[PDB]
mmCIF file with all atom_site columns, all heavy atoms in Angstrom:
data_model
loop_
_atom_site.group_PDB
_atom_site.id
_atom_site.type_symbol
_atom_site.label_atom_id
_atom_site.label_alt_id
_atom_site.label_comp_id
_atom_site.label_asym_id
_atom_site.label_entity_id
_atom_site.label_seq_id
_atom_site.pdbx_PDB_ins_code
_atom_site.Cartn_x
_atom_site.Cartn_y
_atom_site.Cartn_z
_atom_site.occupancy
_atom_site.B_iso_or_equiv
_atom_site.pdbx_formal_charge
_atom_site.auth_seq_id
_atom_site.auth_comp_id
_atom_site.auth_asym_id
_atom_site.auth_atom_id
_atom_site.pdbx_PDB_model_num
ATOM 1   N N   . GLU B 1 114 ? 114.520 83.570 97.425 1.00 0.00 ? 114 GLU B N   1
ATOM 2   C CA  . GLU B 1 114 ? 114.198 82.804 96.212 1.00 0.00 ? 114 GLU B CA  1
ATOM 3   C C   . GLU B 1 114 ? 114.246 83.759 95.044 1.00 0.00 ? 114 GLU B C   1
ATOM 4   O O   . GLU B 1 114 ? 114.889 83.466 94.013 1.00 0.00 ? 114 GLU B O   1
ATOM 5   C CB  . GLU B 1 114 ? 112.784 82.229 96.294 1.00 0.00 ? 114 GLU B CB  1
ATOM 6   C CG  . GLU B 1 114 ? 112.551 81.215 95.157 1.00 0.00 ? 114 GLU B CG  1
ATOM 7   C CD  . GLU B 1 114 ? 111.077 81.026 94.820 1.00 0.00 ? 114 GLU B CD  1
ATOM 8   O OE1 . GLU B 1 114 ? 110.446 81.987 94.253 1.00 0.00 ? 114 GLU B OE1 1
ATOM 9   O OE2 . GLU B 1 114 ? 110.587 79.929 95.175 1.00 0.00 ? 114 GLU B OE2 1
ATOM 10  N N   . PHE B 1 115 ? 113.507 84.858 95.091 1.00 0.00 ? 115 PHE B N   1
ATOM 11  C CA  . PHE B 1 115 ? 113.473 85.829 94.056 1.00 0.00 ? 115 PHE B CA  1
ATOM 12  C C   . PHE B 1 115 ? 114.891 86.254 93.641 1.00 0.00 ? 115 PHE B C   1
ATOM 13  O O   . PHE B 1 115 ? 115.143 86.271 92.416 1.00 0.00 ? 115 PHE B O   1
ATOM 14  C CB  . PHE B 1 115 ? 112.724 87.056 94.530 1.00 0.00 ? 115 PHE B CB  1
ATOM 15  C CG  . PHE B 1 115 ? 112.736 88.242 93.546 1.00 0.00 ? 115 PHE B CG  1
ATOM 16  C CD1 . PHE B 1 115 ? 112.139 88.101 92.277 1.00 0.00 ? 115 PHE B CD1 1
ATOM 17  C CD2 . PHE B 1 115 ? 113.451 89.410 93.852 1.00 0.00 ? 115 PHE B CD2 1
ATOM 18  C CE1 . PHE B 1 115 ? 112.212 89.168 91.307 1.00 0.00 ? 115 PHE B CE1 1
ATOM 19  C CE2 . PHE B 1 115 ? 113.473 90.476 92.940 1.00 0.00 ? 115 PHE B CE2 1
ATOM 20  C CZ  . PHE B 1 115 ? 112.856 90.321 91.706 1.00 0.00 ? 115 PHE B CZ  1
ATOM 21  N N   . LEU B 1 116 ? 115.746 86.646 94.584 1.00 0.00 ? 116 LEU B N   1
ATOM 22  C CA  . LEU B 1 116 ? 117.077 87.026 94.259 1.00 0.00 ? 116 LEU B CA  1
ATOM 23  C C   . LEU B 1 116 ? 117.856 85.960 93.600 1.00 0.00 ? 116 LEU B C   1
ATOM 24  O O   . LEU B 1 116 ? 118.952 86.164 93.049 1.00 0.00 ? 116 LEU B O   1
ATOM 25  C CB  . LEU B 1 116 ? 117.801 87.513 95.532 1.00 0.00 ? 116 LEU B CB  1
ATOM 26  C CG  . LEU B 1 116 ? 117.301 88.849 96.137 1.00 0.00 ? 116 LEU B CG  1
ATOM 27  C CD1 . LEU B 1 116 ? 118.283 89.352 97.181 1.00 0.00 ? 116 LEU B CD1 1
ATOM 28  C CD2 . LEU B 1 116 ? 117.100 89.859 95.023 1.00 0.00 ? 116 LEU B CD2 1
ATOM 29  N N   . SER B 1 117 ? 117.340 84.688 93.661 1.00 0.00 ? 117 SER B N   1
ATOM 30  C CA  . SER B 1 117 ? 117.969 83.551 93.065 1.00 0.00 ? 117 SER B CA  1
ATOM 31  C C   . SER B 1 117 ? 117.362 83.075 91.821 1.00 0.00 ? 117 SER B C   1
ATOM 32  O O   . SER B 1 117 ? 117.838 82.163 91.126 1.00 0.00 ? 117 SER B O   1
ATOM 33  C CB  . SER B 1 117 ? 117.976 82.358 94.086 1.00 0.00 ? 117 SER B CB  1
ATOM 34  O OG  . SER B 1 117 ? 118.733 82.671 95.256 1.00 0.00 ? 117 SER B OG  1
ATOM 35  N N   . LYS B 1 118 ? 116.241 83.695 91.427 1.00 0.00 ? 118 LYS B N   1
ATOM 36  C CA  . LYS B 1 118 ? 115.481 83.319 90.215 1.00 0.00 ? 118 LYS B CA  1
ATOM 37  C C   . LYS B 1 118 ? 116.415 83.302 88.980 1.00 0.00 ? 118 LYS B C   1
ATOM 38  O O   . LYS B 1 118 ? 117.360 84.077 88.947 1.00 0.00 ? 118 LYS B O   1
ATOM 39  C CB  . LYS B 1 118 ? 114.300 84.276 89.943 1.00 0.00 ? 118 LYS B CB  1
ATOM 40  C CG  . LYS B 1 118 ? 113.176 84.134 90.932 1.00 0.00 ? 118 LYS B CG  1
ATOM 41  C CD  . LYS B 1 118 ? 111.934 84.950 90.474 1.00 0.00 ? 118 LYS B CD  1
ATOM 42  C CE  . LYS B 1 118 ? 110.768 84.766 91.465 1.00 0.00 ? 118 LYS B CE  1
ATOM 43  N NZ  . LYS B 1 118 ? 109.574 85.546 91.054 1.00 0.00 ? 118 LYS B NZ  1
ATOM 44  N N   . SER B 1 119 ? 116.107 82.424 88.063 1.00 0.00 ? 119 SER B N   1
ATOM 45  C CA  . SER B 1 119 ? 116.889 82.296 86.910 1.00 0.00 ? 119 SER B CA  1
ATOM 46  C C   . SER B 1 119 ? 116.933 83.597 86.050 1.00 0.00 ? 119 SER B C   1
ATOM 47  O O   . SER B 1 119 ? 117.921 84.276 85.940 1.00 0.00 ? 119 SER B O   1
ATOM 48  C CB  . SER B 1 119 ? 116.428 81.142 86.038 1.00 0.00 ? 119 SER B CB  1
ATOM 49  O OG  . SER B 1 119 ? 116.656 79.945 86.689 1.00 0.00 ? 119 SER B OG  1
ATOM 50  N N   . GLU B 1 120 ? 115.770 83.913 85.429 1.00 0.00 ? 120 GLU B N   1
ATOM 51  C CA  . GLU B 1 120 ? 115.698 85.099 84.618 1.00 0.00 ? 120 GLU B CA  1
ATOM 52  C C   . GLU B 1 120 ? 116.113 86.357 85.304 1.00 0.00 ? 120 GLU B C   1
ATOM 53  O O   . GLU B 1 120 ? 116.422 87.359 84.686 1.00 0.00 ? 120 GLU B O   1
ATOM 54  C CB  . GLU B 1 120 ? 114.262 85.236 84.081 1.00 0.00 ? 120 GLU B CB  1
ATOM 55  C CG  . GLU B 1 120 ? 113.194 85.007 85.144 1.00 0.00 ? 120 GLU B CG  1
ATOM 56  C CD  . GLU B 1 120 ? 111.813 84.964 84.502 1.00 0.00 ? 120 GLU B CD  1
ATOM 57  O OE1 . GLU B 1 120 ? 111.373 85.965 83.871 1.00 0.00 ? 120 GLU B OE1 1
ATOM 58  O OE2 . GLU B 1 120 ? 111.121 83.912 84.627 1.00 0.00 ? 120 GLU B OE2 1
ATOM 59  N N   . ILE B 1 121 ? 116.203 86.300 86.655 1.00 0.00 ? 121 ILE B N   1
ATOM 60  C CA  . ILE B 1 121 ? 116.593 87.461 87.472 1.00 0.00 ? 121 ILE B CA  1
ATOM 61  C C   . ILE B 1 121 ? 118.165 87.508 87.527 1.00 0.00 ? 121 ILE B C   1
ATOM 62  O O   . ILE B 1 121 ? 118.715 88.562 87.196 1.00 0.00 ? 121 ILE B O   1
ATOM 63  C CB  . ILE B 1 121 ? 116.094 87.439 88.907 1.00 0.00 ? 121 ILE B CB  1
ATOM 64  C CG1 . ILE B 1 121 ? 114.580 87.799 88.922 1.00 0.00 ? 121 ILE B CG1 1
ATOM 65  C CG2 . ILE B 1 121 ? 116.846 88.360 89.793 1.00 0.00 ? 121 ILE B CG2 1
ATOM 66  C CD1 . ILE B 1 121 ? 114.330 89.276 88.485 1.00 0.00 ? 121 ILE B CD1 1
ATOM 67  N N   . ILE B 1 122 ? 118.751 86.419 87.885 1.00 0.00 ? 122 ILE B N   1
ATOM 68  C CA  . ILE B 1 122 ? 120.197 86.304 88.008 1.00 0.00 ? 122 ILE B CA  1
ATOM 69  C C   . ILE B 1 122 ? 120.941 86.400 86.677 1.00 0.00 ? 122 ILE B C   1
ATOM 70  O O   . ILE B 1 122 ? 121.988 87.010 86.606 1.00 0.00 ? 122 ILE B O   1
ATOM 71  C CB  . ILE B 1 122 ? 120.662 84.960 88.759 1.00 0.00 ? 122 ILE B CB  1
ATOM 72  C CG1 . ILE B 1 122 ? 120.273 85.075 90.209 1.00 0.00 ? 122 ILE B CG1 1
ATOM 73  C CG2 . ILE B 1 122 ? 122.059 84.668 88.507 1.00 0.00 ? 122 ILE B CG2 1
ATOM 74  C CD1 . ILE B 1 122 ? 120.568 83.843 91.006 1.00 0.00 ? 122 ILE B CD1 1
ATOM 75  N N   . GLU B 1 123 ? 120.342 85.807 85.625 1.00 0.00 ? 123 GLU B N   1
ATOM 76  C CA  . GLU B 1 123 ? 120.965 85.796 84.284 1.00 0.00 ? 123 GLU B CA  1
ATOM 77  C C   . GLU B 1 123 ? 120.838 87.114 83.500 1.00 0.00 ? 123 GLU B C   1
ATOM 78  O O   . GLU B 1 123 ? 119.778 87.601 83.175 1.00 0.00 ? 123 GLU B O   1
ATOM 79  C CB  . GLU B 1 123 ? 120.224 84.684 83.478 1.00 0.00 ? 123 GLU B CB  1
ATOM 80  C CG  . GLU B 1 123 ? 120.348 83.340 84.121 1.00 0.00 ? 123 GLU B CG  1
ATOM 81  C CD  . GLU B 1 123 ? 119.557 82.316 83.294 1.00 0.00 ? 123 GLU B CD  1
ATOM 82  O OE1 . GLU B 1 123 ? 118.284 82.477 83.103 1.00 0.00 ? 123 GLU B OE1 1
ATOM 83  O OE2 . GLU B 1 123 ? 120.130 81.310 82.922 1.00 0.00 ? 123 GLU B OE2 1
ATOM 84  N N   . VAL B 1 124 ? 122.059 87.693 83.327 1.00 0.00 ? 124 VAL B N   1
ATOM 85  C CA  . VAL B 1 124 ? 122.226 88.976 82.642 1.00 0.00 ? 124 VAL B CA  1
ATOM 86  C C   . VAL B 1 124 ? 122.595 88.706 81.143 1.00 0.00 ? 124 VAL B C   1
ATOM 87  O O   . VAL B 1 124 ? 123.722 88.222 80.856 1.00 0.00 ? 124 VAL B O   1
ATOM 88  C CB  . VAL B 1 124 ? 123.261 89.813 83.282 1.00 0.00 ? 124 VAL B CB  1
ATOM 89  C CG1 . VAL B 1 124 ? 123.299 91.203 82.604 1.00 0.00 ? 124 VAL B CG1 1
ATOM 90  C CG2 . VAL B 1 124 ? 123.022 89.970 84.768 1.00 0.00 ? 124 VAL B CG2 1
ATOM 91  N N   . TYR B 1 165 ? 119.145 95.949 90.470 1.00 0.00 ? 165 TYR B N   1
ATOM 92  C CA  . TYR B 1 165 ? 119.624 94.957 89.561 1.00 0.00 ? 165 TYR B CA  1
ATOM 93  C C   . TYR B 1 165 ? 121.127 95.196 89.386 1.00 0.00 ? 165 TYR B C   1
ATOM 94  O O   . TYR B 1 165 ? 121.926 94.208 89.451 1.00 0.00 ? 165 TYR B O   1
ATOM 95  C CB  . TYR B 1 165 ? 118.910 95.113 88.225 1.00 0.00 ? 165 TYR B CB  1
ATOM 96  C CG  . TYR B 1 165 ? 119.049 93.939 87.301 1.00 0.00 ? 165 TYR B CG  1
ATOM 97  C CD1 . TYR B 1 165 ? 118.502 92.702 87.631 1.00 0.00 ? 165 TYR B CD1 1
ATOM 98  C CD2 . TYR B 1 165 ? 119.638 94.052 86.027 1.00 0.00 ? 165 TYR B CD2 1
ATOM 99  C CE1 . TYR B 1 165 ? 118.610 91.592 86.801 1.00 0.00 ? 165 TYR B CE1 1
ATOM 100 C CE2 . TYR B 1 165 ? 119.710 92.979 85.166 1.00 0.00 ? 165 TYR B CE2 1
ATOM 101 C CZ  . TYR B 1 165 ? 119.163 91.746 85.495 1.00 0.00 ? 165 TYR B CZ  1
ATOM 102 O OH  . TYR B 1 165 ? 119.207 90.652 84.692 1.00 0.00 ? 165 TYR B OH  1
#
Side-chain angles (χ1 to χ4, degrees):
Chain B
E114 191 204 72
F115 173 66
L116 291 193
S117 298
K118 289 187 178 182
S119 295
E120 45 189 300
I121 284 295
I122 285 178
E123 304 176 302
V124 187
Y165 195 62

